[PDB]
Amino acid sequence: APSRNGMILKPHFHKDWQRRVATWFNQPARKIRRRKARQAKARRIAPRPASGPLRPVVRCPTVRYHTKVRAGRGFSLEELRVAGIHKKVARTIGISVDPRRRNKCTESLQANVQRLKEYRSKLILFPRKPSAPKKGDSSAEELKLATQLTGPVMPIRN
């Protein structure tokens, strides 16, 4: 029974909110459950970027959002034959492969290629064995670091 100026209100509580209410007194213990994963995963994979693999620069879709940029899913395929990285190798080298992106422009292609070219250069390939041959980066470039990258690898700033 309305009285003198309000809104209409179709509050939707005619069903049964009561039974299916989730309260959130997990929230903070969950915060911590999470903490211990972030934590543990890093200590397990010791030298490896804690955040996760390298992930591509990418443009947001719909018209409003245009001007932004993101970590995309993974770098395209077309992208790799160009950087000279085999798609199945990339996946082992902490390089994120989406294989499902239609690459339409040379602008965002080379932009995103430069990230791989950049990655190669500042990547210490820790060798199969200790007494190991080619492509693994030398015992100097090896001693210097035990360094997990905290935060997103080569973070994408607009």
Other Cβ atoms within 10 Å of 72 Cβ, number:
18
Binding of RNA by 9 (CB under 7 A): yes
Please, which residues bridge with residue 71 across strands?
A: 57
Chain positions 117 to 146 lying near RNA, rule: CB under 7 A, are: 117-118, 121, 128-129, 133-134
Q: Residue 13 or residue 143: which is nearer to RNA going by CB? A: 13
Please count the residues of this chain forming the interface with RNA, following the rule CB under 7 A.
86
**Cβ neighbours for 89, distance < 8 A, ≥ 6 positions apart:** none
Give how far Cα 26 sits from Cα of 22, 23, 30, 41, Å. Answer: 10, 8, 6, 22
CB of 142 to RNA, least distance (A): 17
Site for RNA in 31-50 (CB under 7 A): 31-39, 41, 43
- Minimum CB separation of residue 121 from RNA in Å reads 5
Cα distance from N-terminal residue to C-terminal residue, the chain: 53
Cα separation, 27 vs 33, whole angstroms:
10
Out of 47, 82, 93, 107, the residue judged to bind RNA by CB under 7 A: 107
Residues 74-103 that bind RNA (CB under 7 A): 74, 77, 81, 86-88, 91, 96-103
Residue from 46, 47, 66, 141 in contact with RNA (CB under 7 A)? 66
